[PDB]
Amino acid sequence: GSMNPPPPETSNPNKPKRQTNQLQYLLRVVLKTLWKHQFAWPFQQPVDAVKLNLPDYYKIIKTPMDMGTIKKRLENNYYWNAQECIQDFNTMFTNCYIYNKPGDDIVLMAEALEKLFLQKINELPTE
Ligand SMILES: CN1CC[C@H](C(=O)NC2CCCCC2)C[C@H](Cn2cc3c(=O)n(C)cc(-c4ccn(C)n4)c3n2)C1
């Protein structure tokens, strides 16, 4: 079985970064709400394809993303803008929908979290 890839970076000294009120909202409200949700745990860390015995995961998913990575990127001030962070959440959900089958429990958990995510993003503050 294949090894896991290196996880997505959560810091980079050469990548410019900043604080915006929208990024602060993403950490304090959006990530907090999803992180603490009962369906969060499959998404709280990179997929461990070795432990989960999913030898095809990283053959199929070439742009992995997870909320552990997002949480660290927010905490570490990795992002320049909110759109980068929203793209990471979209990538996470999309990967789940591509890899898994439409009836699977993981897909129903992703759908519930995505509905909550889209509600909280519609409330993003100006700036
Ligand atoms: C053949 N099967 C069918 C459906 C299975 C399914 O729906 N399992 C869920 C897992 C969550 C709890 C309820 C049951 C999933 C299999 C593989 N799989 C895909 C995954 C996925 O995309 N992510 C993001 C995370 C996990 C995962 C599972 C456990 N952790 C820590 N992370 C994961 N596992 C594939």
UniProtKB/Swiss-Prot annotation:
Supply the source organism for this entry: Homo sapiens (Human)
Q: Where in the cell is it found?
A: Nucleus; Chromosome
The residues covered by the Bromo domain are 18-124
Q: Site: Acetylated histone binding. Where?
A: 100
**Gene behind this chain?**
BRD4
Q: What is written about domains in the entry's comments?
A: The NET domain mediates interaction with a number of chromatin proteins involved in transcription regulation (NSD3, JMJD6, CHD4, GLTSCR1 and ATAD5). The C-terminal (CTD) region mediates interaction and recruitment of CDK9 and CCNT1 subunits of the P-TEFb complex. It is also required for maintenance of higher-order chromatin structure.
Note the position of the cross-link Glycyl lysine isopeptide (Lys-Gly) (interchain with G-Cter in SUMO2): 59
**Full-sequence range covered:** 44 to 167 of 1362
Q: How does it assemble?
A: Interacts with p53/TP53; the interaction is direct. Interacts (via CTD region) with CDK9 and CCNT1, acting as an associated component of P-TEFb complex. Interacts with RELA (when acetylated at 'Lys-310'). Interacts (via NET domain) with NSD3, CHD4, BICRA and ATAD5. The interaction with BICRA bridges BRD4 to the GBAF complex. Interacts (via NET domain) with JMJD6 (via JmjC and N-terminal domains); the interaction is stronger in presence of ssRNA and recruits JMJD6 on distal enhancers. Interacts with NSD3. Interacts with NIPBL. (Microbial infection) Interacts with bovine papillomavirus type 1 regulatory protein E2. This interactions may serve for the tethering of viral genomes to host mitotic chromosomes allowing successful partitioning of the viral genome during cell division.
Function text: Chromatin reader protein that recognizes and binds acetylated histones and plays a key role in transmission of epigenetic memory across cell divisions and transcription regulation. Remains associated with acetylated chromatin throughout the entire cell cycle and provides epigenetic memory for postmitotic G1 gene transcription by preserving acetylated chromatin status and maintaining high-order chromatin structure. During interphase, plays a key role in regulating the transcription of signal-inducible genes by associating with the P-TEFb complex and recruiting it to promoters.
The disorder on record is: Cornelia de Lange syndrome 6: A form of Cornelia de Lange syndrome, a clinically heterogeneous developmental disorder associated with malformations affecting multiple systems. It is characterized by facial dysmorphisms, abnormal hands and feet, growth delay, cognitive retardation, hirsutism, gastroesophageal dysfunction and cardiac, ophthalmologic and genitourinary anomalies. CDLS6 inheritance is autosomal dominant. A chromosomal aberration involving BRD4 is found in a rare, aggressive, and lethal carcinoma arising in midline organs of young people. Translocation t(15;19)(q14;p13) with NUTM1 which produces a BRD4-NUTM1 fusion protein.
Question: What more does the entry say?
Answer: JQ1, a thieno-triazolo-1,4-diazepine derivative, and I-BET, a benzodiazepine derivative, have been tested on tumors with success. Treatment with GSK1210151A (I-BET151, a I-BET derivative) has strong effets on mixed lineage leukemia and promotes myeloid differentiation and leukemia stem-cell depletion.
Q: State the source organism's domain of life.
A: Eukaryota
What post-translational modification does the entry describe? Answer: Phosphorylation by CK2 disrupt the intramolecular binding between the bromo domain 2 and the NPS region and promotes binding between the NPS and the BID regions, leading to activate the protein and promote binding to acetylated histones. In absence of phosphorylation, BRD4 does not localize to p53/TP53 target gene promoters, phosphorylation promoting recruitment to p53/TP53 target promoters.
Coiled-coil segments, which residues?
Answer: none
Expression tissues: Ubiquitously expressed.
Family to which the UniProt record says this protein belongs: Belongs to the BET family.
Name-wise, this protein is Bromodomain-containing protein 4
